[PDB]
């Protein structure tokens, strides 16, 4: 619409795509809660290495445990939809399904506070460079 | 008449997101190796956090767009300028600080605890030592590139004085670019001209001209267009005390003290120098990775990025360690020292995510002259000051070019040479087509809307 | 080829983050607290009580 | 001098964290295995993602 | 001199009776130098011994 | 004690602790577990004989 070909490109709004929304608009929040009892659990092993059978190869004797390893824990929950209730007058299983949602958080610990220490017995230090 | 950016503009209610992806930059900590055959052929660069990490964005013209609504937009007078209202830096490293040191450092002795007499003559006494530096966390933003002073030499004088030889000096006020070195406590100065041994300084910074930013003159700048916001947090203390090893050019007056004799007859030099130490750092001392909302700027430009560009900088020291390699050449059975070879590197990742608001600026006959006073560029970036060009009458009218009556024709117009930034090596980002408006689908606009009372 | 030795510092009972309740007002994502698959993978890292 | 190209994982148990010594593959990178302490020359250590 | 700026203004004040005196309600310190520390010593310094060990 | 059925031994408590190392030393006994040989290169001369760890 001018005297030039004028072939600079143009910018557009992107196409309307079906999007994501939060998990907050279609859930029917309940007022019933249940406890997660996870009574004390034990773990031992040598922090230098896992020790093994010399006869076998995949027969450990103690493992290798230390604080700087990734301490991930996998919990397993029951399904709420299989459960026995006193009441279901609030809940039609034909059209509605049950899901969990955590509310409560705590890390129980069981050790005096204090850190271990190590270092290589054939560490190759050339010289000091502090002074 | 000096007036802020709050007295002639209209604040819309439309907000657009920007966010940057993974920055790739890994290089050597100490220096950039080149080819032995060619100086312009590097294989690894010099990277450090102690470089001024000065980056610049590329943002598109908002007037280049198409939307069904233009009731807000009269296209005759009104125009569109970008302004930033939200930000965050993303960083992706574990915390770790590296240390450095010249292998021929100018330590004569230690001067913290004792000196058994006396200093000894000799022309060659250097050695390797190593030490950390000043710690910091900082940033700055402004739509003009940030400045910085650094000290250097001067012209000597007229030769009226016939007393002695001690050189002149001057600070030098400059816009700092990417890669340049921060001062760490030895003054913001040159290490090649002001020093002469290059052995007082570690090798990576012994061949440098370190600067310090001039926030002061940027504060006494009228508009505040090189500054929107800035941060800083720094601490320091000494580690030890050592001394230089050279002829002290200045003597000390005598009646100030009493001289000794015999073994104590020689007066030792007093060319002491300290050596630094940063403190412990914690994760509570973290500056980055948080939102710092624009609600009140320091100057007249309230977030307005002129030229659709910004000049961001940052200096961090807690992620300044260097990972190294240790590989062999030969497979062995026992431990020999000649077998293994090292290579050291240093890693960096920057992520930058922003929130905006476009604002329609109606143009009267008065504000056009006001911006004409500031700078005529954005005016002709809106193409508003035009002149009708004459000179249509051309009759270079042939059909052929390979003839026998030549006129020695000349071509290739280099006409778009207008940028001043060509002398200045930045690291950049073109974020131009990375845009949308659905802030619920972004991990910062969700945080923005709950912050914004929405 | 210089190298330092890292040290750490004092540890306190106030630097402790555990043995205390938490009640999160709002989770970070669009998922505002809904777990799925009847499982979750919780992780903690503590070297502070790691004496041997 | 080899350039390195990163890649991720999924953090499982029995993986050690980076303790200031760089998230890298200590088996594939430093053949001497005696430049670091004992526990860390064999396996690798990880720094988790907080951005993707 | 505060008494030397104003043109003769009757209703504002009377220079015959009223006086103009400065005060101060504002102050800002400017510092140009970055953070840094230095030392000072003595090469004929009197010390007998050390006593901390 | 926090999970005692009545809780009659903890009405209230406090605790306040600080700790950090000073020095690093080693023990001299003939240890139990020999080191796996793969983790290092074998010694040479005075490094061929092994110290404690």
XYZ file of N, CA and C in Angstrom, chain B residues 31-216:
558
model
N 42.684 -17.909 30.826
C 42.895 -17.146 29.606
C 42.247 -17.860 28.430
N 42.109 -17.126 27.331
C 41.655 -17.678 26.063
C 42.860 -18.097 25.234
N 42.952 -19.384 24.925
C 43.996 -19.863 24.028
C 43.606 -19.490 22.605
N 44.600 -19.227 21.774
C 44.387 -18.985 20.361
C 45.083 -20.080 19.573
N 44.956 -20.012 18.261
C 45.782 -20.868 17.435
C 47.213 -20.342 17.443
N 48.213 -21.227 17.433
C 49.589 -20.754 17.233
C 49.815 -20.227 15.832
N 48.986 -20.646 14.877
C 49.066 -20.155 13.514
C 48.255 -18.885 13.296
N 47.328 -18.558 14.196
C 46.400 -17.466 13.942
C 45.833 -16.926 15.247
N 45.871 -15.601 15.391
C 45.408 -14.967 16.619
C 43.892 -14.850 16.691
N 43.188 -14.998 15.569
C 41.736 -14.869 15.556
C 41.039 -16.221 15.628
N 41.773 -17.279 15.949
C 41.221 -18.626 16.024
C 41.402 -19.150 17.442
N 40.419 -18.872 18.296
C 40.401 -19.456 19.628
C 39.714 -20.811 19.574
N 39.942 -21.622 20.604
C 39.217 -22.872 20.777
C 38.435 -22.872 22.084
N 38.989 -22.252 23.120
C 38.295 -22.030 24.379
C 38.441 -20.552 24.718
N 37.447 -19.919 25.326
C 37.611 -18.537 25.776
C 38.057 -18.471 27.232
N 38.365 -17.255 27.665
C 38.518 -16.938 29.079
C 37.127 -16.601 29.592
N 36.656 -17.346 30.587
C 35.432 -16.995 31.293
C 35.740 -16.885 32.781
N 35.041 -15.966 33.448
C 35.052 -15.831 34.901
C 33.836 -15.009 35.299
N 33.425 -15.145 36.560
C 32.396 -14.269 37.086
C 32.928 -12.903 37.446
N 34.252 -12.778 37.564
C 34.911 -11.514 37.864
C 34.950 -10.595 36.647
N 34.590 -11.109 35.480
C 34.309 -10.260 34.343
C 32.995 -9.535 34.584
N 32.916 -8.314 34.061
C 31.669 -7.552 34.056
C 30.726 -8.265 33.098
N 29.664 -8.847 33.650
C 28.747 -9.666 32.865
C 27.609 -8.799 32.349
N 27.850 -8.093 31.250
C 26.985 -7.009 30.798
C 26.224 -7.499 29.574
N 24.918 -7.679 29.713
C 24.166 -8.228 28.602
C 23.104 -7.252 28.118
N 22.622 -7.512 26.908
C 21.689 -6.617 26.239
C 20.632 -7.456 25.534
N 19.393 -6.965 25.526
C 18.282 -7.708 24.958
C 17.969 -7.188 23.556
N 17.253 -8.005 22.783
C 16.588 -7.547 21.565
C 15.093 -7.795 21.714
N 14.329 -6.714 21.688
C 12.882 -6.666 21.786
C 12.291 -6.005 20.539
N 11.189 -6.535 20.011
C 10.651 -6.007 18.756
C 9.831 -4.742 18.939
N 9.666 -4.039 17.823
C 8.785 -2.886 17.746
C 7.346 -3.317 18.014
N 6.702 -2.770 19.052
C 5.299 -3.121 19.307
C 4.331 -2.550 18.290
N 4.762 -1.591 17.475
C 3.912 -1.028 16.440
C 3.879 -1.887 15.183
N 4.604 -3.005 15.170
C 4.668 -3.915 14.035
C 3.605 -4.998 14.084
N 2.481 -4.756 14.742
C 1.605 -5.841 15.145
C 0.206 -5.691 14.568
N -0.582 -6.750 14.736
C -1.964 -6.759 14.306
C -2.896 -7.373 15.328
N -3.887 -6.599 15.771
C -4.889 -7.011 16.736
C -6.249 -6.442 16.348
N -7.360 -7.146 16.663
C -8.684 -6.671 16.232
C -9.108 -5.374 16.900
N -8.609 -5.132 18.110
C -8.909 -3.890 18.813
C -7.908 -2.831 18.365
N -8.451 -1.664 18.033
C -7.689 -0.427 17.904
C -8.480 0.756 18.436
N -9.502 0.479 19.249
C -10.236 1.543 19.923
C -9.353 2.276 20.918
N -8.462 1.548 21.579
C -7.423 2.143 22.402
C -6.402 2.892 21.555
N -6.223 2.482 20.297
C -5.100 2.970 19.502
C -5.568 3.809 18.318
N -5.516 5.116 18.500
C -5.554 6.004 17.349
C -4.220 5.921 16.621
N -4.171 5.413 15.389
C -2.890 5.265 14.694
C -2.357 6.548 14.081
N -3.074 7.660 14.227
C -2.596 8.923 13.688
C -1.503 9.501 14.572
N -1.839 9.782 15.825
C -0.904 10.384 16.761
C -0.259 9.403 17.721
N -0.991 8.419 18.236
C -0.494 7.633 19.350
C 0.584 6.651 18.901
N 1.387 6.219 19.871
C 2.533 5.354 19.630
C 2.645 4.379 20.796
N 3.589 3.444 20.692
C 3.746 2.373 21.666
C 5.201 2.238 22.082
N 5.444 2.363 23.389
C 6.770 2.171 23.965
C 6.689 1.073 25.017
N 7.718 0.233 25.051
C 7.798 -0.844 26.023
C 8.324 -0.355 27.367
N 7.822 -0.963 28.438
C 8.302 -0.729 29.790
C 8.285 -2.027 30.586
N 9.314 -2.207 31.409
C 9.477 -3.413 32.207
C 8.948 -3.182 33.611
N 8.184 -4.150 34.113
C 7.551 -4.034 35.423
C 7.928 -5.226 36.294
N 8.452 -6.290 35.676
C 8.805 -7.487 36.410
C 10.050 -8.140 35.845
N 10.750 -8.864 36.717
C 12.004 -9.497 36.330
C 12.297 -10.670 37.250
N 13.144 -11.577 36.759
C 13.936 -12.442 37.625
C 15.129 -12.962 36.846
N 16.237 -13.133 37.553
C 17.425 -13.816 37.069
C 17.285 -15.293 37.417
N 17.660 -16.161 36.475
C 17.846 -17.562 36.777
C 19.302 -17.985 36.686
N 19.742 -18.693 37.724
C 21.100 -19.208 37.800
C 21.042 -20.699 38.100
N 22.028 -21.430 37.590
C 21.951 -22.876 37.635
C 23.202 -23.604 38.079
N 23.859 -23.134 39.131
C 25.091 -23.765 39.574
C 25.033 -24.027 41.069
N 25.729 -25.053 41.545
C 26.018 -25.127 42.974
C 27.034 -24.066 43.344
N 27.051 -23.729 44.623
C 27.893 -22.638 45.084
C 29.329 -23.124 45.228
N 30.280 -22.326 44.749
C 31.685 -22.659 44.872
C 32.580 -21.553 44.357
N 33.590 -21.185 45.132
C 34.467 -20.071 44.806
C 35.830 -20.626 44.424
N 36.424 -20.061 43.380
C 37.771 -20.438 43.002
C 38.796 -19.450 43.515
N 40.067 -19.839 43.494
C 41.157 -18.975 43.919
C 42.168 -18.865 42.780
N 42.988 -17.817 42.831
C 43.989 -17.575 41.800
C 45.254 -17.023 42.438
N 46.300 -16.908 41.625
C 47.556 -16.369 42.100
C 48.638 -16.328 41.044
N 49.479 -15.301 41.094
C 50.605 -15.215 40.189
C 51.672 -16.227 40.600
N 52.272 -16.925 39.632
C 53.325 -17.891 39.962
C 54.673 -17.264 40.266
N 54.777 -15.945 40.197
C 55.994 -15.207 40.493
C 55.662 -13.990 41.338
N 54.887 -14.209 42.401
C 54.310 -13.126 43.189
C 55.372 -12.291 43.891
N 55.031 -11.026 44.128
C 55.942 -10.070 44.757
C 55.854 -10.104 46.275
N 56.014 -11.289 46.844
C 56.162 -11.456 48.284
C 57.654 -11.504 48.560
N 58.158 -10.516 49.289
C 59.515 -10.657 49.789
C 59.514 -11.505 51.053
N 58.840 -11.027 52.096
C 58.725 -11.745 53.360
C 57.273 -11.750 53.817
N 57.038 -12.199 55.045
C 55.780 -11.961 55.730
C 56.010 -10.913 56.808
N 55.029 -10.039 56.985
C 55.168 -8.927 57.915
C 53.967 -8.844 58.843
N 53.514 -9.994 59.328
C 52.482 -10.042 60.349
C 53.034 -10.210 61.749
N 54.027 -11.078 61.930
C 54.422 -11.550 63.250
C 55.836 -11.152 63.633
N 56.790 -11.214 62.705
C 58.188 -11.016 63.080
C 59.013 -10.606 61.875
N 60.217 -10.083 62.141
C 61.302 -9.952 61.165
C 62.601 -10.069 61.953
N 63.259 -11.209 61.809
C 64.655 -11.317 62.188
C 65.500 -10.605 61.141
N 66.328 -9.665 61.593
C 67.142 -8.855 60.699
C 68.189 -9.686 59.957
N 68.682 -9.195 58.808
C 68.169 -8.132 57.936
C 67.707 -8.599 56.568
N 67.099 -7.687 55.815
C 66.812 -7.932 54.411
C 68.111 -8.078 53.628
N 68.075 -8.944 52.627
C 69.275 -9.350 51.916
C 69.225 -8.807 50.497
N 70.354 -8.505 49.866
C 70.332 -8.078 48.463
C 70.063 -9.269 47.548
N 69.646 -8.955 46.325
C 69.304 -9.969 45.346
C 68.359 -9.431 44.294
N 68.458 -9.940 43.068
C 67.677 -9.412 41.962
C 66.579 -10.358 41.502
N 66.399 -11.498 42.163
C 65.465 -12.500 41.656
C 64.989 -13.368 42.810
N 63.773 -13.106 43.316
C 63.279 -13.828 44.484
C 61.786 -14.165 44.448
N 61.197 -14.439 43.285
C 59.748 -14.601 43.209
C 59.328 -16.065 43.337
N 58.041 -16.275 43.624
C 57.521 -17.616 43.868
C 56.019 -17.646 43.608
N 55.485 -18.866 43.520
C 54.053 -19.092 43.377
C 53.360 -19.030 44.731
N 52.296 -18.231 44.808
C 51.320 -18.337 45.886
C 49.935 -18.112 45.286
N 48.899 -18.300 46.106
C 47.523 -18.227 45.623
C 46.606 -17.751 46.742
N 45.525 -17.062 46.358
C 44.623 -16.449 47.327
C 43.300 -16.091 46.652
N 42.226 -16.089 47.443
C 40.905 -15.644 47.027
C 40.847 -14.120 46.896
N 39.638 -13.615 46.654
C 39.406 -12.220 46.308
C 38.249 -11.653 47.120
N 37.796 -10.476 46.699
C 36.632 -9.836 47.301
C 35.366 -10.539 46.831
N 34.457 -10.828 47.759
C 33.187 -11.439 47.399
C 32.150 -10.352 47.147
N 31.133 -10.681 46.349
C 30.024 -9.763 46.115
C 28.826 -10.487 45.524
N 27.722 -9.747 45.480
C 26.565 -10.030 44.646
C 25.967 -8.677 44.305
N 25.658 -8.452 43.030
C 25.243 -7.130 42.584
C 24.541 -7.247 41.240
N 23.854 -6.170 40.861
C 23.242 -6.046 39.543
C 22.919 -4.583 39.304
N 22.516 -4.261 38.076
C 22.054 -2.935 37.699
C 21.266 -3.034 36.400
N 20.281 -2.148 36.262
C 19.480 -2.060 35.048
C 19.292 -0.601 34.641
N 19.470 -0.311 33.352
C 19.077 0.962 32.781
C 19.069 0.868 31.274
N 18.211 1.679 30.651
C 18.041 1.629 29.202
C 19.120 2.389 28.442
N 20.127 2.911 29.133
C 21.399 3.288 28.545
C 22.451 2.387 29.168
N 23.522 2.071 28.440
C 24.535 1.156 28.972
C 25.278 1.773 30.142
N 25.623 0.969 31.146
C 26.165 1.517 32.392
C 27.617 1.943 32.272
N 27.969 2.931 33.079
C 29.265 3.579 32.980
C 30.234 2.990 33.997
N 31.421 3.578 34.076
C 32.382 3.150 35.062
C 33.721 3.844 35.005
N 34.232 4.222 36.167
C 35.539 4.843 36.189
C 36.620 3.786 36.356
N 37.839 4.175 36.003
C 39.036 3.379 36.213
C 40.221 4.320 36.127
N 41.235 4.052 36.934
C 42.370 4.949 37.057
C 43.468 4.554 36.081
N 44.208 5.550 35.614
C 45.274 5.316 34.670
C 46.355 6.357 34.838
N 47.104 6.571 33.765
C 48.198 7.529 33.779
C 47.674 8.934 33.494
N 48.596 9.861 33.271
C 48.257 11.186 32.788
C 49.406 11.718 31.964
N 49.254 12.959 31.507
C 50.402 13.677 30.961
C 51.272 14.099 32.139
N 52.594 14.117 31.934
C 53.524 14.228 33.053
C 53.422 15.564 33.773
N 53.976 16.614 33.155
C 53.855 18.044 33.448
C 54.710 18.834 32.473
N 54.703 20.155 32.619
C 55.841 20.934 32.173
C 57.059 20.595 33.031
N 58.238 20.909 32.509
C 59.490 20.513 33.146
C 60.032 21.596 34.068
N 59.133 22.357 34.700
C 59.540 23.357 35.683
C 60.154 22.703 36.915
N 59.553 21.618 37.388
C 60.085 20.871 38.514
C 61.264 20.016 38.067
N 62.371 20.158 38.787
C 63.583 19.391 38.524
C 63.913 18.542 39.744
N 62.872 18.126 40.463
C 63.052 17.427 41.728
C 63.302 15.936 41.541
N 62.336 15.219 40.975
C 62.383 13.761 40.956
C 61.540 13.241 39.798
N 61.376 11.920 39.754
C 60.542 11.239 38.771
C 59.501 10.417 39.517
N 58.261 10.906 39.545
C 57.148 10.076 39.973
C 55.985 10.347 39.037
N 55.334 9.306 38.510
C 54.499 9.488 37.328
C 53.152 10.102 37.679
N 52.492 10.729 36.716
C 51.154 11.271 36.943
C 50.093 10.181 36.884
N 48.837 10.620 36.919
C 47.709 9.717 37.083
C 46.402 10.399 36.709
N 45.403 9.600 36.337
C 44.047 10.097 36.148
C 43.070 8.936 36.168
N 41.870 9.188 36.676
C 40.764 8.265 36.507
C 40.162 8.489 35.130
N 39.482 7.473 34.620
C 38.947 7.559 33.273
C 37.530 7.022 33.258
N 36.603 7.887 32.877
C 35.179 7.615 32.962
C 34.718 6.975 31.662
N 34.202 5.752 31.755
C 33.878 4.996 30.555
C 32.645 4.127 30.744
N 31.860 3.952 29.689
C 30.814 2.941 29.663
C 31.488 1.587 29.541
N 31.238 0.720 30.517
C 31.889 -0.583 30.565
C 31.093 -1.524 29.666
N 31.790 -2.425 28.979
C 31.147 -3.450 28.174
C 31.299 -4.818 28.840
N 30.744 -5.842 28.187
C 30.852 -7.210 28.677
C 32.302 -7.682 28.654
N 32.677 -8.460 29.667
C 33.975 -9.094 29.727
C 35.008 -8.349 30.540
N 34.805 -7.056 30.787
C 35.814 -6.247 31.460
C 35.884 -6.614 32.935
N 36.984 -6.259 33.588
C 37.247 -6.800 34.914
C 36.860 -5.825 36.016
N 36.276 -6.372 37.085
C 35.949 -5.578 38.259
C 37.206 -5.392 39.104
N 37.286 -4.253 39.786
C 38.305 -4.081 40.805
C 37.980 -4.951 42.019
N 39.034 -5.474 42.660
C 38.841 -6.357 43.806
C 39.502 -5.826 45.075
N 39.982 -4.586 45.068
C 40.595 -3.993 46.240
C 41.912 -3.297 45.992
N 42.526 -3.489 44.826
C 43.779 -2.832 44.481
C 43.544 -1.548 43.699
N 42.384 -0.932 43.881
C 41.980 0.192 43.070
C 41.446 -0.242 41.716
N 40.555 0.581 41.171
C 40.080 0.389 39.802
C 41.058 1.032 38.816
N 41.935 0.198 38.275
C 43.114 0.717 37.608
C 43.660 -0.236 36.555
N 44.651 0.264 35.821
C 45.369 -0.513 34.820
C 46.505 -1.263 35.494
N 46.731 -2.489 35.048
C 47.812 -3.308 35.566
C 48.997 -3.370 34.619
N 48.818 -2.956 33.364
C 49.927 -2.946 32.429
C 50.730 -1.664 32.443
N 50.060 -0.518 32.498
C 50.728 0.778 32.475
C 51.147 1.259 33.849
N 50.253 1.159 34.830
C 50.569 1.648 36.162
C 51.542 0.719 36.868
N 51.369 -0.581 36.710
C 52.419 -1.471 37.160
C 53.437 -1.679 36.053
N 54.514 -2.333 36.401
C 55.536 -2.589 35.400
C 56.145 -3.973 35.508
N 55.906 -4.685 36.605
C 56.415 -6.042 36.690
C 55.392 -7.069 36.244
N 54.095 -6.754 36.422
C 52.958 -7.665 36.210
C 53.060 -8.903 37.095
N 53.803 -8.779 38.195
C 54.068 -9.897 39.084
C 53.540 -9.600 40.475
N 53.041 -8.388 40.693
C 52.227 -8.097 41.853
C 50.830 -8.678 41.723
N 50.404 -8.967 40.496
C 49.022 -9.270 40.142
C 48.975 -10.682 39.571
N 47.930 -11.465 39.847
C 47.756 -12.752 39.162
C 47.568 -12.574 37.662
N 47.927 -13.639 36.935
C 48.137 -13.605 35.486
C 46.882 -13.219 34.711
N 45.716 -13.693 35.137
C 44.441 -13.377 34.511
C 44.081 -11.902 34.600
N 44.623 -11.192 35.583
C 44.284 -9.797 35.807
C 45.533 -8.929 35.786
N 46.704 -9.541 35.604
C 47.921 -8.747 35.451
C 47.992 -8.016 34.120
N 47.176 -8.392 33.143
C 47.176 -7.758 31.832
C 45.823 -7.108 31.586
N 45.324 -6.390 32.589
C 43.973 -5.859 32.502
C 43.895 -4.400 32.927
N 42.725 -3.790 32.721
C 42.413 -2.427 33.154
C 41.091 -2.549 33.903
N 41.149 -2.796 35.205
C 39.929 -3.067 35.950
C 39.206 -1.761 36.253
N 37.879 -1.815 36.295
C 37.064 -0.632 36.495
C 36.219 -0.764 37.756
N 35.560 0.327 38.114
C 34.525 0.393 39.132
C 33.399 1.222 38.537
N 32.138 0.831 38.718
C 31.036 1.546 38.055
C 30.795 2.913 38.677
N 30.482 3.887 37.825
C 30.185 5.223 38.313
C 28.692 5.442 38.453
N 28.090 4.763 39.424
C 26.746 5.060 39.898
C 26.587 6.500 40.368
N 27.670 7.142 40.813
C 27.604 8.511 41.300
C 27.237 9.493 40.202
